[PDB]
Paper text:
The orphan nuclear receptor NR2F6 (Nuclear Receptor subfamily 2 group F member 6) is an emerging therapeutic target for cancer immunotherapy. Upregulation of NR2F6 expression in tumor cells has been linked to proliferation and metastasis, while in immune cells NR2F6 inhibits antitumor T-cell responses. As a true orphan receptor, endogenous ligands modulating NR2F6 activity remain unknown. Although NR2F6 has been demonstrated to exert both activating − and repressing ,− effects on gene transcription, the cofactor proteins mediating NR2F6 transcriptional activity remain to be elucidated. It has been proposed that the mechanism behind NR2F6 transcriptional repression is the direct recruitment of corepressor proteins to DNA-bound NR2F6 homo- or heterodimers (e.g., with RXRs), , while transcriptional activation could occur through direct recruitment of coactivator proteins to DNA-bound NR2F6 or through indirect recruitment via the interaction with other DNA-bound transcription factors. , Since the NR2F6 LBD itself confers transcriptional repressive activity, the direct recruitment of NR coregulators to the NR2F6 LBD was investigated.
To improve protein stability, the NR2F6 LBD was truncated to residues 199–393 and fused to a mutant MBP containing surface entropy reduction (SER) mutations . Initial needle-like crystals were obtained by preincubation of MBP-NR2F6 with the NSD1 peptide. Subsequent additive screening optimized the initial hit condition, yielding diffraction-grade crystals that enabled elucidation of the NR2F6 LBD/NSD1 peptide cocrystal structure at 2.6 Å in the P61 space group (crystal data collection and refinement statistics are listed in Table S2). NR2F6 forms a typical NR homodimer, with the dimerization interface formed by H7, H9 and H10 and the loops between H8–H9 and H9–H10, similar to previously reported crystal structures of NR homo- and heterodimers. In both monomers of NR2F6, H10 breaks at P364, with the lower half of this helix collapsing into the orthosteric ligand binding pocket. The α-helical NSD1 peptide binds the interface formed by H3, H10 and H12, with L911 and L914 of NSD1 buried into the hydrophobic surface pocket created by residues A207, L210 and F211 on H3, F373, L376 and V377 on H10 and T380, I382, L385 and M389 on H12.
Residue numbers in the entry:
A (entry chain D), B (entry chain C): 1 to 18
C (entry chain B): 1 to 435, 447 to 568
D (entry chain A): 2 to 437, 449 to 568
The structure:
Amino acid sequence: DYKFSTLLMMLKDMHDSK
Amino acid sequence: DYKFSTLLMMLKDMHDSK
Amino acid sequence: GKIEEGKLVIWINGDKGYNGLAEVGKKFEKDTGIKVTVEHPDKLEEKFPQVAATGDGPDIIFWAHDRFGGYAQSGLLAEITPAAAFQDKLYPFTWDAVRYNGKLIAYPIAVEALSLIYNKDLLPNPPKTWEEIPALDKELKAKGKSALMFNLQEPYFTWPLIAADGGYAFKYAAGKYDIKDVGVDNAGAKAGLTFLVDLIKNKHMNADTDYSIAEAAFNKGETAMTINGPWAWSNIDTSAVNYGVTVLPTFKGQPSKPFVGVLSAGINAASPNKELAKEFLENYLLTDEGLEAVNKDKPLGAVALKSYEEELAKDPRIAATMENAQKGEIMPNIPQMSAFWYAVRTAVINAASGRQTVDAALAAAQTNAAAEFIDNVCELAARLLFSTVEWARHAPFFPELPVADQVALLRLSWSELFVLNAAQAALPLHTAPLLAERAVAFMDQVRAFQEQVDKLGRLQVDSAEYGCLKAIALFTPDACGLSDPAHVESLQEKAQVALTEYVRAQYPSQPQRFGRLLLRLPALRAVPASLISQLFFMRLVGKTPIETLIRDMLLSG
Amino acid sequence: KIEEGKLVIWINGDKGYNGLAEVGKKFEKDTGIKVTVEHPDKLEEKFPQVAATGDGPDIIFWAHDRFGGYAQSGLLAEITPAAAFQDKLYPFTWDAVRYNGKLIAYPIAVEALSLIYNKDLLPNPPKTWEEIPALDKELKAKGKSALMFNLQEPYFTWPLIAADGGYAFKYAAGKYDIKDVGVDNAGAKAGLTFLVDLIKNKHMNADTDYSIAEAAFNKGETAMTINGPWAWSNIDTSAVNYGVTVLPTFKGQPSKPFVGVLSAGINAASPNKELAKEFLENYLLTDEGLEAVNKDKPLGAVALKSYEEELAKDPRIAATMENAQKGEIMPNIPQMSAFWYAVRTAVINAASGRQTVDAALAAAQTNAAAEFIDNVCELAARLLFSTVEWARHAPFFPELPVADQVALLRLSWSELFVLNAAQAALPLHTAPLLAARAVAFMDQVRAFQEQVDKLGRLQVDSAEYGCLKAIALFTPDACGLSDPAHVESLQEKAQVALTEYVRAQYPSQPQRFGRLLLRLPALRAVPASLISQLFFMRLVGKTPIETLIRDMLLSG
Ligand SMILES: OC[C@H]1O[C@H](O[C@H]2[C@H](O)[C@@H](O)[C@@H](O)O[C@@H]2CO)[C@H](O)[C@@H](O)[C@@H]1O
Ligand SMILES: OC[C@H]1O[C@H](O[C@H]2[C@H](O)[C@@H](O)[C@@H](O)O[C@@H]2CO)[C@H](O)[C@@H](O)[C@@H]1O
């Protein structure tokens, strides 16, 4: 549904946990 | 001897004087 | 900027009678000493919300009522408060058109509806159905003439046909318009637009026709019929044509349903001359004398002023105007009407040119018109971002680059590729700016974003050209820290040569297409990468820059 | 006005004016001409002020650095000693007082700063500046400090700033380059940072000046100081048993003191030019004359060969000349006073804590170089006017409505300017670095330079520059343009013009046309604010060029 929004969120979080 | 510098200054003053 | 006090500046459309209105201004100036300047800027329905957002613009804005609810929502219009004695002078249903959330936001002036205008010497009996037209055109084509010519660029003029069989924009449900229920792609809407497109395929009509071509053609006697409003009657009067005004033809047995507008005058919320504007509008324009002055310049239609309407009503042309109005529908004044109008504008142009099919065009218009949520556009943009990265990764010669060079190229060019993808994918770019001082500057980049996408549409850039343009943007030597800048220049040249060979073969009649395509690239870089994040990805990635997220992807695998 | 029949002499107060007045008394005894010596405050500033009006002394004494400025201002008489007299003085001293091929002063003595140290409190002085902090800690526990020298005058701190790479004006092809100033390079920053670090760590106090340092050293409170030969007299009369040695090294490299040649110039307005010549040549510039001054306050290595051969045996003169050989003789060019004031402000602010070393030296760089004496901003200003006049006469532009003309130049003026700046080789590598958010500015400056380079490597000729300017000018991306289609067709005419040109002129480069067009996206990326920040901020301040350009276009 909001597939690529959540994809972008994951990229965000991964980057955040660095 | 700084001719176009003063030209530019006259444009500034002209504009400031409104 | 700011609005000058002690005078009145008025904006009215150029097809209306601004010279008659300026005469009323002279009468006002004579009695009060207040200068009234009437102006007819281009695209003023778009100009007014832009300039009035900054406290600028005219004191009085004239337009059909459908754009005023949006204006009032944005706080751009002063609420008018005429005494009951004045309101009694105007027909109640005209007041209804200019009421928004219980507040009168404009003075209604006249009711305008499209009619079938026909040349009585070339066509004593005009067709009662749209289906008779092609046979009539074939008969007339053999005499140096065409049957019908009307403006195909504005959807106002083609809506009557689209709506005839079932097209309906926004459904009126429980005493208010339902923004969820849009009727732009139902069976009836497809039927109407298909008939229109079929008239163009069969060379009974030309997709390029606009207002000027149609009016010139009719008034010169080259065509037997046109579709227009009362404002157009003046120029036929002065021309040689002996004409009639009648009911629009039916489609599939049903009346054409023109969208009816009420010419209205709103007072700018930032005007320091609100009392002057009220004085001018109530006591000078909305009078038998004031309206007659404007009507003799360009007919206004059925005027809202009862005393003057009773006389004009006896005019056969006004009777024809109201018959079409009664078969069509008074436009909603809700803010979402401009979205609707924009959606249907692009749909009809693409469908009539042959670029898209009828169903495809109206399908897109349906989503665009029907969208009170940015969740979908932000989802589309999010995918185009992933699509953009994956495109570059597999672009010829890119996978063989060192990864630092891959990152460097995408660091600069990702936003450019994104805009190209957004243009190619018809990303709907007309919505609020999600809410400063230079905010105005931010808004200008939004328009430069929109305008460049439009230029790419008007160029009719095809998929093969989009592929080349993306490669030319990707392999840019302007990137920083390339290990082999010469290698990237030769990669850009391969894409340049590829685009050269393509257009030379595919568009041999346009020898300057190659250059014209490259001339769109400078506007690509001007769209800042921060604007894309601000508009689509701020909610998802906050402060984090897209560039470093892309670097992650490239180094992820 | 200046009195005739006598001599008025101005010499600094740290010099031996009483010895010089003794030479004046001998001159008066032989000739009857009264000689009055005076030591006014800040006379290097006083002399040009009074001499501009035809007043002041007949003879002015100062280091040679301020004489080129004086001679430029017409304040100094050209001296004309016979060849026989000139041969009595070392040639390199005559070089110090030569300006545009004209000798403008008599050279007297070579002075350079040395490390002066107390032998009883420090038998072996530090070879490096880096030893000082540990030495100061050690000495502080005995009631004393390691080092105290004048921090108010940049003369005294320059040796350290220059050690690692600091320089004032680069010597290039036999002359000093006022465009190339070295006050904010890495080496200058390294030197000034060490000095400031000595103050932060309380090894030195920023308020120290000449009197505090000399009093401290001569009273035995500090182990070391930095001063010239003039200061030796007061140490002789004091209790201290002292040595004169090489200045310590910084980062392995010698300290580089700025070498001065004490010189005597004749006021251009003096009516006593011959008397002054007779005094200087036959009385002062003699073994006896110089000895009289030297016994008051030592002059250094004197320019007079016969007397320098005697003094040369002095270990302290040997130390003086060793330090001089590690430094450089100051330029005598007019811009030296700009330099000295610029660095003066830098060291005081940095040492007080007011500004950071980087900020302080950034400002000194601007002042010392003055935008190449503001010539670059002057060239840029001409290019700006050139840009407007170019567009106005560009084919098809004059026939546009004025609102469309304004709209086009509103967007494209900066691009046309950049094309003109590349064509005109406007110096951009100079990187003014004039601040008023950091890497970002610096990134766009590098993108500006790199695009101009790309235009060079393309070898864009004058004809192509004409076309590229037209293609950029007639852009439909401008806002508010009546008939945008007309402008598209004008851009196409320019596009076709470039196509026809390159096909004919460079047939072996079939890709040159598109290649040239691919330089345009970088033209738009150069922000107009960057152009103003680097060239026009001083002239138009906050005002945006766009507004000013509209005025130019719609002025006439
Ligand atoms: O076609 C879209 C357009 O339709 C209406 O504009 C009409 C206007 O009401 C008429 O008075 C006349 O000027 O023709 C216009 C279309 O050519 C809507 O009022 C407008 O908001 C909408 O964009
Ligand atoms: O401090 C900058 C200053 O340096 C030189 O002045 C020296 C002078 O050469 C010495 O003889 C002695 O008087 O100390 C001065 C520094 O206090 C330059 O001659 C002078 O122009 C410059 O301002």
